[model samples]
Target: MNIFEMLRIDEGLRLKIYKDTEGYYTIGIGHLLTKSPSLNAAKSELDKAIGRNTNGVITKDEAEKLFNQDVDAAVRGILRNAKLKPVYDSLDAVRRAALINMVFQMGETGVAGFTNSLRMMQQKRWDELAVNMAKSRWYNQTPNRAKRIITTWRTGTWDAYK
Candidate 1:
């Protein structure tokens, strides 16, 4: 399924984006209106930056690029880069990337804020990793959103291919 579709944004919303240039329409970035280039517009812009997908949808790739920008910054922003390299490197590509996505979605501080989850990581406890991921500021703060993503994390099926 399309990412926007998963998010409950439909083509009508997509057309709405095309109809106007100014004002805030809540994109994946959240509420807070933007001027000329709105959220969906921004996604279209980024989609142009990358190649278009097979579905002819630019929003997905665009959203991904936006998230990638944040993910790269968060990973590089660590103060103790060396100390964390081993921990970071120990993760598989999918796991590491998913963690970065999680961190980007939940700020660097938010990811760090998962005190219990980090402990689970340290212990290599996948079960605890699943549950601990759900118990967080990200979870409680974002209403059911935290649960949604955590449920994805819990299942371990939220991969790039997925």
Candidate 2:
């Protein structure tokens, strides 16, 4: 139900370097290691931050550190978003965690693009919001997650976990 557990199920943890479906160098529970255009630049940042040769791997503790940092960033981004702030302020902590977990995949700005969905959410139009959610490319790409996210949104339940 919490953000960490919910995201762990969807994102899956890995302590070593791996290529995501989008061909990005991701590590440590979907943390994108390659934020830069250059591979060397990205690798150096990872090596420098972890302060180890790493050799394309990280420790469980280090991975959790990255996960916490990433989660905090998402929370901050969600708060900073003007469109999200009002709806976020109106939500319960459980639903708040749902949005934060979603930000892990969509990025805060990505969610902000859903003007219609946000309107439906703000208006408390649960059915309309579900329709909006179903129409997304994200819905098609990750239907399971999409279904549960919408359910979590409408009913404020942890269907993703429970």
Candidate 3:
């Protein structure tokens, strides 16, 4: 699968409010509405798609829209950095998508903090990159998705199904 399907597999489709691994308030295919703030603020945004449900659920179509927006946000956020441009450019399609995937779930700063890991990935050191990725809080916290991504990178293929 491509980046989109890979993300769908990792995120899964959720209709109602639930907590992520970090306990953030998320809904509709990992579309994190908000955290540590007013529930109405998040609810305010979801009104467009989650209207009339009254049960905090979203339809698949709306979920897909949110998913698309979130994915775009992640990709654009990762690409917006001046410091990370060269490293992003250094990667191929699958590697770039994997990087974007990480950024999608972790934010740009979260992913960017991995100085050594980024260097190893930029250098195309597949084995070391996988090993280094495993030595992170992300992998420790959500080993399932991390392992899938690491395995994807190790194989250097776009098969997120693995």
Candidate 4:
């Protein structure tokens, strides 16, 4: 079977809420519970019908489908809200993906908080952007990931990532 099938088999789809291995009140395939306030605003009528407050259950297929759409939304939000589309378009695919991933983790507003970094990015000042990113709280919160992103900023490749 394919990896998706293997993952489904391994994860064991559940149509009811259950605590995950770490007991984070997971449901469906394995959507761990956390405060996802952003999604709450965009939730559809169908989304509301499925879960109990945020711990509702869903089919494996449903989970996978929603997951893809949610990622797409995050990507879209990053691309649309950055106001640096021309600069972003100038970068290679890997750098663009890294920036999108950063926005995905930090949210558009959060990422936008790096004013100097954003300005440096728009100017194609990779070294300056790297230095600015390294000075932020984001770097403190995830030093390893920050290091990976910083490496990407310094090098044009995604070695530290994928």
Candidate 5:
């Protein structure tokens, strides 16, 4: 059948934590766990939702699924935002991918805050846009990725940034 059915059949419906075949602390439909306070908080929220300590288990897999969906929505937001549409459409696939990644790193609203950068992009001023990006907080935080993206933006071709 489909992936949903396959996972359901193989993983079974678990509402609480259990050890998987590989001895991972799993919940839901085979969601493995690690040491993360965020995960615990999510679990607590679920507990509160269904009534704390009641007979229920939300499973780690459920949380993982939700996280995946949220990520997809965020990417979609980057792709569909009216303000970002110009950047999303003006570039080729590779450059478009770069813009989406940047949006993912800094939310669509965050990236939009780079008004000069976006304006330069719209005007096809690749050099000015590159300079603007190089001077931004994004570049300071992720110089390596920014360098590659800047090179691609300038030349419209993948070039080694090193």
Candidate 6:
């Protein structure tokens, strides 16, 4: 099912933070919507605030639109610059999405910054890529999340499911 279908409303929010015990629930910084809005509105507000330095509000549609734009920009850069086209050109939707998810969290610069890792990937050194990825700031930043995503990327398992 599509993301919208899976997370139609607060159900999605519940899914997102169901087990988030670490309390990193500020969305961005200084964002406190007195009450939770609809999924779309909350999402839009989040999208606007995430890349910015303020706590601006957003409509649901606006959030989705910006999200699409940011994701598109990141993906386009990866396809054009990272020579990720090879994997993109070969992988199935699931694998590609997993990779893009990682890139999305790390940003194009971070993903592209992995010179040794990319070299290893180009040489089909899956082992090295795995190691290099774990050794990254991205990995160290969110240990639990990184472990889950890395495992999912490699094993195609959703053991991280909440």
Using lDDT as the measure, the top candidate is 2
Tens digit of lDDT per residue, candidate 1, span 1-106? 3233233321122321232222333332321123445455554543454455323233644544544454457577543444344455665444454465455454
Per-model C-alpha lDDT, please?
0.47, 0.82, 0.81, 0.61, 0.62, 0.51
* lDDT, candidate 6, 4-104, per-residue tens: 22122212222121112233332311122223435555545555555542333444554455456645765786798645767556655544665666565
Candidate 2 lDDT tens digits, 1-162: 578989888888887777776677788888887755667766776897688888778998999998999999998998888988887887788878877877888788888888888887778788778888899888898788788888888787786578
Best-performing candidate as measured by TM-score: 2
Worst 10-residue lDDT window for candidate 5 reads 1-10
Report lDDT (Cα) of residue 36, candidate 4. 38
C-alpha root-mean-square deviation, each candidate: 8.2, 1.9, 2.3, 7.0, 10.2, 8.1
Please give the ranking of all candidate structures by lDDT, highest first, separated by commas: 2, 3, 5, 4, 6, 1
The number of clashing residue pairs in each candidate reads 1, 0, 0, 1, 4, 2
Which regions of candidate 2 deviate over 4 angstroms?
35-42
Error of 3 at 92 (Å): 1.2
Query: Which lDDT tens digits does candidate 5 get at residues 29-108?
Result: 44444334455654555565445563336645555564455346556886688888877777776566567556644568
**lDDT, candidate 3, 39-134, per-residue tens:** 666676567545654456778888898899888888788778765667788988888888888888888898888889888877888999899889
TM-score of 4: 0.63
Error of 5 at 58 (Å): 15
True-structure Cα RMSD, model 3: 2.3
Residue ranges of candidate 6 with Cα displaced over 4 Å: 1-55, 123-128, 157-162
* Candidate 2: clashing pairs of residues: none
Error of 4 at 72 (Å): 1.0
Tell me model 5's lDDT, rounded to 2 decimals: 0.62
